[PDB]
């Protein structure tokens, strides 16, 4: 029996993703059209942050790749955020073949620039989980000058799509070992069961000290019950965002709001009232109680986000099988987590505010 899946083709500029260096079987993340970025920053930003930062940080990237809703490969995205992982011995190995295998001049000037774009995304508050969209995993490619024809599986099992070379037709999901974080071993779930795969971003909101991390988490938990497991890992980021994410918002000093008196006003029958026609008349509305609530500089929910997840797929096995090998990407040996038999299902993002 042959299972059913779905292919996509798209003509893609090869500035940010390289289907030649990244071999068949890596993740791909698509963007919005970058004319939308400098205006959403102008509109969704909290008061007192530089809206003129996202339009300048992206402008320094297009002027760095010349020496259009494109595509960012996963191995490019991990090495851009490589200064924020725990296993720094392998995080500087993923960067080691990004600068050395990607076609171009000074690829190492893109990573320090694209990460400056992602730091401008968190700061100008257009979060890239509203911009990075899932696109399928690589099965084949057709090369050309300055662009390529990318074939991918937007939905289905990875191991069903034919590669094209009859010497080695299949492709397994290839991931670097820096992003792949289990929750079976670290929590103690050793029992068999089908496992879900999740894409997870993490932020950290400070003044010019902001981060990015991209993870692929394998778990036996539903998407309805991931938020207690993300909080246990990333609760350090949750605390640092509620007190330091609210900065240059001007607070009311000292407080102006009194306590809310409706429990005391409604108990006393001597308090003055109004009818349905008497209200919204100034002769009768001034006799009531005056109440001027002040919500300014409060740490709102969107200014306290620490992570964001989405569905990515599952492994319908009883015992899902991972591997830890060191594949050679050209001349650089890289710690690689190899996933076996991934059935792709995209889903919508979900902030962990």
């Amino acid at each position: 029996g042959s299972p059913r899946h779905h292919l996509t083709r798209q003509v893609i500029l090869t500035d940010l993703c390289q289907p030649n260096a990244d071999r068949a079987g890596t993740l791909l993340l698509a963007l919005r059209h970058p004319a939308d970025l400098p205006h959403l920053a102008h509109q969704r930003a909290p008061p007192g942050r530089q809206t003129e930062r996202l339009g300048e940080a992206w402008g320094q990237l297009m002027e760095a790749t010349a020496l259009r809703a494109g595509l960012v490969s996963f191995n490019f995205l991990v090495a851009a955020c490589a200064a924020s992982y725990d296993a720094r011995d392998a995080a500087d190995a993923v960067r080691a073949h990004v600068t050395a295998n990607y076609r171009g001049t000074r690829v190492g000037a893109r990573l320090d620039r694209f990460s400056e774009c992602l730091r401008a995304m968190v700061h100008t508050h257009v979060f890239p989980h509203e911009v990075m969209r899932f696109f399928g995993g690589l099965v084949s490619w057709v090369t050309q000058d300055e662009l390529a024809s990318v074939t991918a599986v937007c939905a289905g099992p990875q191991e069903a799509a034919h590669t094209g070379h009859p010497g080695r037709p299949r492709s397994a999901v290839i991931l670097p070992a820096c992003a792949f974080v289990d929750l079976d071993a670290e929590l103690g779930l050793g029992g068999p069961g089908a496992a879900f795969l999740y894409l997870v971003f993490t932020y950290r909101q400070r003044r010019d000290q902001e981060l990015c991390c991209v993870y692929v988490i394998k778990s036996q938990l539903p998407p309805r019950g991931l938020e207690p497991a993300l909080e246990r890992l990333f609760g350090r980021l949750r605390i640092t965002n509620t007190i330091h994410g609210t900065e240059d918002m001007t607070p009311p000093a000292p407080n102006r709001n009194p306590d809310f008196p409706l429990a005391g006003l409604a108990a006393n029958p001597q308090t003055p009232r109004c009818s349905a026609g008497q209200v919204t008349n100034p002769q009768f509305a001034d006799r009531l109680y005056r109440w001027q609530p002040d919500l300014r500089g409060r740490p709102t929910a969107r200014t306290c986000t620490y992570a964001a997840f989405a569905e990515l797929g599952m492994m319908p096995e009883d015992s899902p099988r991972c591997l830890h090998r060191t594949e050679r990407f050209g001349a650089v040996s890289v710690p690689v987590v190899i996933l076996e038999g991934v059935v792709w299902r995209p889903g919508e993002w979900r902030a962990c505010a």
């Binding site: 001007t250 607070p251 009311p252 000093a253 000292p254 300014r296 500089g297």
Partner: protein, 59 residues
């Protein structure tokens, strides 16, 4: 107009004192010794302190 709006938010939230909204003319800036074309290159951060009478101490 925006420069008067974005200042009273700073004064409403307490940053007892008063506040006087002032329009400087262009020629008052010219005789003060600044180049007018340098400002043309829409809010703009300006540092302001207040000094006392015959004391020396200042905000």
């Amino acid at each position: 107009m925006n420069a008067h709006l974005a200042n009273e938010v700073q004064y409403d939230l307490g940053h007892p004192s008063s506040l006087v909204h002032v329009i400087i003319s262009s020629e008052c800036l010219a005789a003060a010794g600044i180049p007018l074309a340098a400002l043309m290159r829409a809010n703009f951060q300006v540092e302001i302190q207040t000094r006392a009478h015959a004391t020396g101490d200042c905000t």
